[PDB]
Amino acid sequence: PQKVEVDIIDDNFILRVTFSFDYQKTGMDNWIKLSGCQNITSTKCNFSSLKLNVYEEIKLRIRAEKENTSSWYEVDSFTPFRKAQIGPPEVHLEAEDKAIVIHISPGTKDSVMWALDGLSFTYSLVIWKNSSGVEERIENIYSRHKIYKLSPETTYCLKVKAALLTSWKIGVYSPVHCIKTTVENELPPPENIEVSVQNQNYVLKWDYTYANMTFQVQWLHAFLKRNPGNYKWKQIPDCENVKTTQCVFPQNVFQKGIYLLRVQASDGNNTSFWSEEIKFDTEIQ
Amino acid sequence: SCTFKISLRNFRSILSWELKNHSIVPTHYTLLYTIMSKPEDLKVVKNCANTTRSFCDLTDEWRSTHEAYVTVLEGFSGNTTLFSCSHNFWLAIDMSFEPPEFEIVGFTNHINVMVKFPSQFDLSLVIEEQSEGIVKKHKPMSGNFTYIIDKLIPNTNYCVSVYLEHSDEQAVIKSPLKCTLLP
Amino acid sequence: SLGSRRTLMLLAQMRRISLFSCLKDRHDFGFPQEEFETIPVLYNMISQIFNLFSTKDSSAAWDETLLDKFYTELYQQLNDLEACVDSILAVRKYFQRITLYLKEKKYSPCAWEVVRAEIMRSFSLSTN
Numbered sequence: 175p176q177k178v179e180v181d182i183i184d185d186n187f188i189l190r191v192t193f194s195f196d197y198q199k200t201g202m203d204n205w206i207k208l209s210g211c212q213n214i215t216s217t218k219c220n221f222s223s224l225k226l227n228v229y230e231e232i233k234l235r236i237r238a239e240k241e242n243t244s245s246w247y248e249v250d251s252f253t254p255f256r257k258a259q260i261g262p263p264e265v266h267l268e269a270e271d272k273a274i275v276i277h278i279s280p281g282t283k284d285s286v287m288w289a290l291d292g293l294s295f296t297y298s299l300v301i302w303k304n305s306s307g308v309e310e311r312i313e314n315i316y317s318r319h320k321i322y323k324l325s326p327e328t329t330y331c332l333k334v335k336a337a338l339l340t341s342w343k344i345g346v347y348s349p350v351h352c353i354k355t356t357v358e359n360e361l362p363p364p365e366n367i368e369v370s371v372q373n374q375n376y377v378l379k380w381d382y383t384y385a386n387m388t389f390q391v392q393w394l395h396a397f398l399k400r401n402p403g404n405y406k407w408k409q410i411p412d413c414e415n416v417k418t419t420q421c422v423f424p425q426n427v428f429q430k431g432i433y434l435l436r437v438q439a440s441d442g443n444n445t446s447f448w449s450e451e452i453k454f455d456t457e458i459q
Numbered sequence: 460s461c462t463f464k465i466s467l468r469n470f471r472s473i474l475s476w477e478l479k480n481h482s483i484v485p486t487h488y489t490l491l492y493t494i495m496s497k498p499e500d501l502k503v504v505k506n507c508a509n510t511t512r513s514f515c516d517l518t519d520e521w522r523s524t525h526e527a528y529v530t531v532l533e534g535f536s537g538n539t540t541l542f543s544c545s546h547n548f549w550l551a552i553d554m555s556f557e558p559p560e561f562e563i564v565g566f567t568n569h570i571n572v573m574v575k576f577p578s579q580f581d582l583s584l585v586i587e588e589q590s591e592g593i594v595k596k597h598k599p600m601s602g603n604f605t606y607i608i609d610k611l612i613p614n615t616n617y618c619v620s621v622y623l624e625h626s627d628e629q630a631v632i633k634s635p636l637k638c639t640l641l642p
Numbered sequence: 643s644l645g646s647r648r649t650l651m652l653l654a655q656m657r658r659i660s661l662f663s664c665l666k667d668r669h670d671f672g673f674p675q676e677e678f679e680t681i682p683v684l685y686n687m688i689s690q691i692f693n694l695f696s697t698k699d700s701s702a703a704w705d706e707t708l709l710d711k712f713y714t715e716l717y718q719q720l721n722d723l724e725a726c727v728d729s730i731l732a733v734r735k736y737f738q739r740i741t742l743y744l745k746e747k748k749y750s751p752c753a754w755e756v757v758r759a760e761i762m763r764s765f766s767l768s769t770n
């Protein structure tokens with residue numbers, strides 16, 4: 175039996191005849207067959223709910239049968255996890271005048287391999303203009319994320335790979351995806367946002383460059399940007415539809431913790447896109 | 460039911476309890492404990508079984524600040540057991556550190572502070588030196604321990620307190636002030 | 643630092659029921675404490691707690707306000723570790739043990755308490 179050398183992505187196996195599939199854990203006695211991987215065509219067998227944990231250090235046996243004879247291909251006992259490479263992540267886009275939004279999740283969502291490690295992904299990507307091909311490389315992003323400072327009616331392209339700062343392990347790239355930012359926002363966004371405290375209550379102000387705009391202000395827990403699956407910006411009530419370039423509200427409004435903020439301009443007909451975002455400790459003194 | 464207070468007094472951990480709304484009150488009490496991290500049987504704590512007094516010295520029993528302790532206190536009067544309360548404790552959070560006994564002696568330019576220790580935690584010692592409204596923290600432990608506050612001056616009243624500090628966030632329990640002028 | 647003290651309190655506050663009534667369901671998970679320079683094991687350790695208490699299953703078990711304050715502490719903890727920049731395999735297997743325990747227990751209320759109290763030990767161990 176001459177041994178075989180196999181790599182892994184997510185919940186799959188990849189070889190590099192028709193085939194069959196066995197393993198015996200280090201501490202081996204018996205030999206069990208993973209369902210659906212016996213007498214199969216392809217060189218990749220998927221095992222979600224097939225194999226209980228990928229954290230053991232196993233040994234594999236492969237039955238390769240060409241015509242009337244079946245060869246024996248062993249596999250040097252490995253640990254699945256140590257070998258596993260992150261599958262291509264899933265990418266979802268939403269377009270703007272000057273900006274793009276990214277929603278991302280592991281390909282093979284609910285992957286048995288990933289299990290828990292998933293809420294912990296760092297993503298990194300490279301994006302560029304469609305024709306210019308100027309690639310701004312951006313590493314260390316979070317599961318869902320927004321990109322600013324772009325030109326309207328313009329097609330940008332990109333591919334994303336996942337990474338886990340955790341195990342040195344880093345992943346394969348998504349397919350490239352492109353979109354063309356919409357025509358420039360008629361009402362531009364409020365722009366430089368700053369927050370302060372006075373006595374006990376709270377106040378923030380922005381620059382909307384037009385007179386007679388209202389502004390619907392929203393907040394988000396800061397940590398929720400790392401949690402891609404299933405997420406709601408809540409609006410700040412004292413500030414809902416205010417008539418001026420600042421609005422206020424008291425200390426007790428935010429419990430201690432870490433939040434995200436954004437601001438919007440509207441003339442009541444065509445509203446504007448959102449301002450850029452910001453975070454704060456809920457602690458100062 | 461019953462309220463449980465856990466304190467550490469001069470290097471020993473004293474678990475104590477008080478009862479809320481009990482008409483028939485117990486004569487003899489028995490306290491038991493185990494931890495959550497392993498399925499071990501409740502051990503009765505030796506010295507605290509069928510004691511009259513409401514407090515138990517658990518110093519030799521509860522070594523680690525890294526366990527969730529579950530206690531059950533039973534009380535009897537009669538051919539009768541009357542009831543048994545349970546409660547849980549995390550030493551690093553629920554504990555309270557009582558201040559050491561101490562003395563001071565004023566000398567010409569300095570003070571001898573003798574902290575009486577007898578002969579398990581990450582605790583820090585702070586000897587406070589307070590005078591003219593001004594407080595200094597000193598952070599310099601078996602048997603009697605002496606600490607000298609030096610660079611002191613004649614004819615100036617100084618007031619001193621000592622306490623043990625686990626974490627800054629958790630509250631600190633200070634000794635009473637003891638005060639003297641230098642000779 | 644301040645995060646551990648203020649984190650354990652949150653875990654401590656989250657308790658929904660008597661530990662005495664859950665004693666039956668206790669179980670030794672064999673946390674690999676010798677693992678506790680070390681940063682890579684810690685980031686691994688936490689990222690698991692976050693991603694563990696973030697399940698739809700965890701959300702049904704605990705107070706949302708506490709859970710939240712909790713995520714917030716760990717969120718800041720991960721950035722701190724992110725910044726600076728086998729053991730994990732063992733730390734990961736451990737969480738495999740935990741995940742399995744809850745399943746078998748059908749996430750019973752007591753089964754959740756057995757785990758909460760266990761994480762407080764795991765965490766406190768790794769912090770000192």
Ligand SMILES: *[C@@H]1O[C@H](CO)[C@@H](O)[C@H](O)[C@H]1NC(C)=O
Pocket residue numbers: 304305329
């Ligand atoms: C984008 O440019 C690429 C080459 O970079 C080309 O293949 C593609 O057809 C272009 N798309 C559009 C809509 O211009």
